[PDB]
Amino acid sequence: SWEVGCGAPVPLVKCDENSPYRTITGDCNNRRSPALGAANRALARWLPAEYEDGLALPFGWTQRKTRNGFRVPLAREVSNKIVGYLDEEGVLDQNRSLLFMQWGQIVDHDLDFAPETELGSNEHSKTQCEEYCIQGDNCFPIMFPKNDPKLKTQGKCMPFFRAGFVCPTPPYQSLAREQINAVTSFLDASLVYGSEPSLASRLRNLSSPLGLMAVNQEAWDHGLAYLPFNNKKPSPCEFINTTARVPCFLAGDFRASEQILLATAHTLLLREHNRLARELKKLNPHWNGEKLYQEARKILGAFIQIITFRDYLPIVLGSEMQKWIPPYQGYNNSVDPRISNVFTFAFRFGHMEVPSTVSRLDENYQPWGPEAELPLHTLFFNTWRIIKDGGIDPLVRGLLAKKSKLMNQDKMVTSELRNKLFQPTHKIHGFDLAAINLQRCRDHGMPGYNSWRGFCGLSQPKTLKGLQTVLKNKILAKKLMDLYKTPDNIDIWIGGNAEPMVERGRVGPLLACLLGRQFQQIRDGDRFWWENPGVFTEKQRDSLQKVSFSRLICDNTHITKVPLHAFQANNYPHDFVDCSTVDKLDLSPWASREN
Ligand code: HEM
Ligand SMILES: *[C@@H]1O[C@H](CO)[C@@H](O[C@@H]2O[C@H](CO)[C@@H](O[C@H]3O[C@H](CO)[C@@H](O)[C@H](O)[C@@H]3O)[C@H](O)[C@H]2NC(C)=O)[C@H](O)[C@H]1NC(C)=O
Ligand SMILES: *[C@@H]1O[C@H](CO)[C@@H](O[C@@H]2O[C@H](CO)[C@@H](O[C@H]3O[C@H](CO)[C@@H](O)[C@H](O)[C@@H]3O)[C@H](O)[C@H]2NC(C)=O)[C@H](O)[C@H]1NC(C)=O
Ligand SMILES: *[C@@H]1O[C@H](CO)[C@@H](O[C@@H]2O[C@H](CO)[C@@H](O)[C@H](O)[C@H]2NC(C)=O)[C@H](O)[C@H]1NC(C)=O
Ligand SMILES: *[C@@H]1O[C@H](CO)[C@@H](O[C@@H]2O[C@H](CO)[C@@H](O)[C@H](O)[C@H]2NC(C)=O)[C@H](O)[C@H]1NC(C)=O
Numbered sequence: 001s002w003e004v005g006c007g008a009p010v011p012l013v014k015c016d017e018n019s020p021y022r023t024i025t026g027d028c029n030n031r032r033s034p035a036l037g038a039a040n041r042a043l044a045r046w047l048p049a050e051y052e053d054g055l056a057l058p059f060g061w062t063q064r065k066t067r068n069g070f071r072v073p074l075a076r077e078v079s080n081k082i083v084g085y086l087d088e089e090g091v092l093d094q095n096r097s098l099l100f101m102q103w104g105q106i107v108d109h110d111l112d113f114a115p116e117t118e119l120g121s122n123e124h125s126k127t128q129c130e131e132y133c134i135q136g137d138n139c140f141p142i143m144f145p146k147n148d149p150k151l152k153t154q155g156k157c158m159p160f161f162r163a164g165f166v167c168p169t170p171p172y173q174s175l176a177r178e179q180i181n182a183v184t185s186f187l188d189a190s191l192v193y194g195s196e197p198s199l200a201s202r203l204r205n206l207s208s209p210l211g212l213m214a215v216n217q218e219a220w221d222h223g224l225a226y227l228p229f230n231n232k233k234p235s236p237c238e239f240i241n242t243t244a245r246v247p248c249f250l251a252g253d254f255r256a257s258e259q260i261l262l263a264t265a266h267t268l269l270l271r272e273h274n275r276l277a278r279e280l281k282k283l284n285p286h287w288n289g290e291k292l293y294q295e296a297r298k299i300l301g302a303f304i305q306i307i308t309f310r311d312y313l314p315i316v317l318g319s320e321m322q323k324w325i326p327p328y329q330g331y332n333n334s335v336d337p338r339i340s341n342v343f344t345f346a347f348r349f350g351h352m353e354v355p356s357t358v359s360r361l362d363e364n365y366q367p368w369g370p371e372a373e374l375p376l377h378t379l380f381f382n383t384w385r386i387i388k389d390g391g392i393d394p395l396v397r398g399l400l401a402k403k404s405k406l407m408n409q410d411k412m413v414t415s416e417l418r419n420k421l422f423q424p425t426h427k428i429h430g431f432d433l434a435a436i437n438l439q440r441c442r443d444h445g446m447p448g449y450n451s452w453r454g455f456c457g458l459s460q461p462k463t464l465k466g467l468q469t470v471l472k473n474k475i476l477a478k479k480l481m482d483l484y485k486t487p488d489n490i491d492i493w494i495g496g497n498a499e500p501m502v503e504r505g506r507v508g509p510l511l512a513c514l515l516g517r518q519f520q521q522i523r524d525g526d527r528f529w530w531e532n533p534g535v536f537t538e539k540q541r542d543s544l545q546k547v548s549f550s551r552l553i554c555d556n557t558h559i560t561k562v563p564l565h566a567f568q569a570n571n572y573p574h575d576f577v578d579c580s581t582v583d584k585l586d587l588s589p590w591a592s593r594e595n
């Protein structure tokens with residue numbers, strides 16, 4: 001901060017200041033500083049960027065420049081020695097359902113997205129990088145280790161492109177490079193509605209004035225809605241199966257169809273918007289198309305905030321929750337609501353939470369057909385298994401009945417993601433999310449691990465013995481030291497995730513502080529936080545405390561057996577009750593009488 005006004009990215013428009021509704025962009029939440037928290041602006045910097053040349057070149061770029069005296073280890077080598085494992089047996093989280101992993105990806109995507117630099121639908125630069133592994137400009141490739149099998153089978157590196165930065169897209173002249181966040185920092189359902197003035201509108205159904213979202217017209221799920229297909233060919237969803245030829249879904253957020261289970265979640269959310277809107281027309285027949293939209297929207301936003309803050313964070317943060325996120329005391333206009341750059345890597349802990357397979361279950365929660373369990377890697381940008389395999393009901397029950405993967409210092413990220421990741425731009429299932437995430441810390445100029453322990457007021461080990469004590473693991477601590485040669489050099493993502501878990505939580509002390517602070521701020525900094533006096537009415541608020549993800553399921557699918565607490569592990573049928581029983585969102589507090 002303070003070279004104070006830079007930035008052409010920015011969409012440019014005006015504030016109402018008495019509108020009961022959030023903008024699409026995030027603008028106007030904060031009154032004296034109207035752009036704070038808007039999409040298309042820099043991620044905040046809780047600490048100064050640390051770049052090889054102090055301005056923009058990442059560490060690992062210039063082969064002979066060290067970090068603190070040592071060579072940073074290769075992204076992919078750190079991946080092979082620390083991150084991978086072979087045996088999926090015993091890896092499941094006994095007390096977290098698959099939906100736990102999945103709500104996290106919804107929340108993260110509502111909060112932050114640093115898109116890659118594209119810079120041309122022309123250049124052998126998406127090819128000069130692909131084919132020849134030549135580092136330069138925005139090509140910053142992940143080279144393979146000696147002894148890496150991928151050498152024999154794939155090539156010399158994995159393509160990787162530096163993330164977008166503020167102000168331009170051309171090589172910028174001067175400050176310190178800052179990455180763009182392309183979405184709104186406020187937990188506002190921007191992943192359903194869009195963060196842009198352009199997209200938000202294209203998503204709506206403006207033929208009927210019922211304030212509905214547009215739905216797929218080419219296909220149905222027992223007369224229930226699917227998302228509209230996305231327009232844009234070439235389509236990666238089309239690529240994974242050229243026979244089925246089913247395109248990716250068009251949603252509020254571009255990553256919606258990265259995986260069948262995430263696309264599933266988006267579908268439930270679109271469905272609740274229309275459900276809520278048609279319900280609202282019923283109650284206020286005079287109500288307008290816009291008002292229908294803004295009011296369903298406003299409710300969906302409150303809903304995501306509630307499930308997130310009431311059900312999800314306490315079982316990520318565990319005992320640390322109340323020390324970072326005290327109870328709400330009212331909107332604080334002085335709090336900086338912006339997502340920080342480090343949060344977007346801290347939140348990546350969810351990557352260790354992803355299991356190797358996905359199941360479809362039938363109405364008795366039994367294996368659905370003969371090819372019921374699928375390897376995760378065949379589900380990246382796979383929409384055809386939704387539309388041409390029985391809809392989302394079978395995946396939705398899998399979400400409740402199956403478990404998340406447990407972070408585990410020895411078994412860290414599944415091969416499904418570490419070896420077989422499919423990237424929407426290239427052809428092979430053969431990318432490493434782990435290495436990527438590492439290459440990306442470096443891309444974003446993150447401070448190393450001891451800077452972050454310092455920031456969160458935690459001890460900073462400087463020796464192997466120091467490291468074992470913190471990590472509580474001799475083996476892991478020595479692998480890290482051999483590779484990094486000083487804890488000060490440990491990339492934050494893997495430093496943060498290597499720590500044992502706090503009591504009742506799913507992240508360690510370092511992560512709980514970083515996650516914790518961000519969430520506190522996005523809630524205290526949000527003028528439209530659902531509990532903020534005057535946003536909803538006391539009576540509306542009373543009716544919103546009854547929302548539950550189980551209800552959401554009941555009202556939007558043909559499942560009639562759900563668990564009451566969806567995020568913990570639940571065995572069918574003992575933990576499964578009748579949909580016909582779960583608290584419903586009483587929706588009458590929203591009535592409007594003009595006399
Ligand atoms: C496939 C991928 C997932 C599941 C199979 C998956 C899941 C999650 C969860 C559950 C997260 C939070 C709990 C989460 C966090 C973040 N992700 Fe990740 N994710 C899959 C794939 C990807 C890919 C590919 C990326 C791009 C990484 C890059 O640097 O290019 C990715 C990103 C992120 C991310 C950063 C978002 C941003 O600010 O840009 C998380 C916080 N995920 N994932
Ligand atoms: C599996 O994980 C469960 C969910 O995290 C866990 O139970 C939860 O533990 C918290 C800890 O306090 C409790 O929270 C609430 O407890 C009482 C209800 O008895 C409330 O009156 C309090 O106000 C408080 O908020 C709950 O008891 C519970 N959360 C839920 C779902 O309500 C289980 O114990 C875990 N199982 C095992 C074996 O570890
Ligand atoms: C590309 O997608 C194809 C369809 O979207 C998919 O093929 C489909 O999957 C299986 C073949 O393994 C068949 O499922 C069953 O359907 C009939 C019922 O009408 C059964 O009687 C058959 O015996 C069969 O078991 C589908 O018929 C089939 N569809 C087509 C068009 O052939 C492919 O598997 C996908 N290819 C890849 C590599 O993913
Ligand atoms: C916009 O909304 C209208 C009204 O809901 C949709 O048209 C109706 O819904 C289906 C679509 O074929 C059928 O019941 C009727 O043809 C329509 N009924 C009415 C009351 O008009 C339409 O599908 C929506 N458009 C898009 C692209 O989502
Ligand atoms: C609103 O939140 C801000 C967030 O930065 C808090 O900042 C405080 O600043 C005041 C100075 O006016 C001091 O009390 C402290 O230096 C800060 N608090 C602490 C201990 O970090 C502030 O707490 C909040 N303000 C109000 C009025 O609620």
Ligand SMILES: [Ca+2]
Pocket residue numbers: 110111183184185186187188189190191
């Ligand atoms: Ca948002």
